[PDB]
Design a protein around this ligand. Structure first.
Ligand code: GDP
Lengths: 22, 317
């Protein structure tokens, strides 16, 4: 149950406004 | 002895930023070669930010000051890949003119009604400095860089005669092994929270505001029976933005039942109280709270120092 909460709240990281690493 | 530190907390809470900071403080820091490398990244983030504000202007229906600036937008999307290699003075001119517009600033001032990164204004205000052809990024500029992460971020260092391994997990369960080992044998957990997200408008893809999400996550972590022997450290980050915001937007947005005044101090106290109250093992487990600003290298240095001392003292018993 803990892990699905973990992911249910995390990943909303705005991947636009964010570029690829060098 | 070895120390396993684990950074947790929702996206946009400063974890990667904390890591970069660690690289600056206890390691050599970022050299001129690397600083040179991050240039393109800086340009990119700047552009993506201003673009994001522009697209945001749409959904809210926000008209420009002088209509002419509209043309720049059209040009912008074309020149968006022109920096993929150095900013054209034409392009930098565009960005300058746009950021100068009052309506754009009204949208930026209304950035709670959408999703704008917190490294925007930093890059946009210091435009003249970075739009020079001979520009080399400062360490602080690198700190504010936003890089898409795909895997597990790790950094190790030696400090106060101790061996630290620090892990930022992110979200990719594309790696389902080692990922879990990041939760194995942890010395202490550092939960990060963006305070400034108290007044954020409820997105259509949310069932509760971001703060209550962070709360629920914390609840799940503290009272998890796997971390009974793990020291819990809370970073109420982005305190600066919180202080600026709290003068205008009430806490009632986030907690309607809040009766206190809207002073930074009293508010922050209410938040800290709210998080700490979730510990359903208050006797056995104590929570180590700090108010951080991950962009302030000095602050992070001090906070981390104090945390380290805490851990040592815990090690002597
Ligand atoms: N002004 C300000 N900006 C911050 C603070 N902490 C983080 N940020 C910015 O917030 C942005 C997102 O933070 P990020 O490192 O991605 O947090 P993460 O999602 O947990 O990894 C970064 O570009 C930082 O520059 C803070 O205390 N003050």
């Amino acid at each position: 149950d803990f892990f699905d909460i973990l992911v249910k709240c995390q990943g909303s990281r705005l991947d636009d406004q964010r570029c690829a690493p060098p | 002895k070895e120390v396993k530190l684990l950074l947790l907390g929702a996206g946009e809470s400063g974890k990667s930023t904390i890591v970069k900071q660690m690289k600056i403080i206890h390691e050599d820091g970022y050299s001129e070669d690397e600083c040179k490398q991050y240039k393109v990244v800086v340009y990119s983030n700047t552009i993506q930010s201003i673009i994001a504000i522009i697209r945001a202007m749409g959904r809210l229906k926000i008209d420009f000051g002088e209509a002419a600036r509209a043309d720049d937008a059209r040009q912008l999307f074309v020149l968006a890949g022109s920096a993929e290699e150095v900013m054209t003075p034409e392009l930098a001119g565009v960005i300058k003119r746009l950021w100068r517009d009052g309506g754009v600033q009204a949208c930026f001032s209304r950035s709670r009604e959408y999703q704008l990164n917190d490294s925007a204004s930093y890059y946009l205000n210091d435009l003249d400095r970075i739009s020079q052809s001979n520009y080399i990024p400062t360490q602080q500029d690198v700190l504010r860089t936003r890089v898409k992460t795909t895997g597990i971020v790790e950094t190790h260092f030696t400090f106060k005669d101790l061996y630290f391994k620090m892990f930022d997990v992110g979200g990719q369960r594309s790696e389902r092994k080692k990922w879990i080992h990041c939760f194995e044998g942890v010395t202490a957990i550092i939960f990060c929270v963006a305070l400034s997200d108290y007044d954020l408008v409820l997105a259509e893809d949310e069932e509760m505001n971001r703060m209550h999400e962070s709360m629920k996550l914390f609840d799940s972590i503290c009272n998890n029976k796997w971390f009974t022997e793990t020291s819990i450290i809370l970073f109420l980050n982005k305190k600066d933005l919180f202080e600026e915001k709290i003068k205008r937007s009430p806490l009632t947005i986030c907690y309607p039942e809040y009766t206190g005044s809207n002073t930074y101090e009293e508010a922050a106290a209410y938040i800290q109280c709210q998080f700490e109250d979730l510990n359903r093992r208050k006797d056995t487990k104590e929570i180590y709270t700090h108010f951080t600003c991950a962009t302030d290298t000095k602050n992070v240095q001090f906070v981390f120092d104090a945390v380290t001392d805490v851990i040592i003292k815990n090690n002597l018993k």
